[PDB]
């Protein structure tokens, strides 16, 4: 590759398919590399900004 692409789907933090539907999607895709840009809910903006632990230890740099 080059230093700037392409990159697989499973290295992209987006919600995809599972099972027979992934086997179909990689069959019917112009680029199976491409992602459905729905963020992974367990990982994106979780913990919320108003519940971060780093606030209690934050000091002025």
């Amino acid at each position: 590759m080059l230093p700037g692409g392409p990159v697989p789907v499973f290295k992209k933090y987006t919600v995809g398919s599972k099972g027979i539907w992934e086997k179909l999607r990689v069959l019917l895709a112009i680029a199976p590399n491409r992602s459905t840009g729905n963020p992974i809910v367990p990982l994106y903006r979780v913990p919320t900004p108003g519940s971060r632990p780093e606030a209690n230890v934050y000091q002025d740099p």
């Binding site: 903006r45 979780v46 913990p47 919320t48 900004p49 108003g50 519940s51």
Partner: peptide, 11 residues
């Protein structure tokens, strides 16, 4: 209103 809005994880 903040929990609904994803501001705090705890209700």
């Amino acid at each position: 209103h903040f929990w609904l809005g994803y501001g705090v994880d705890t209700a």
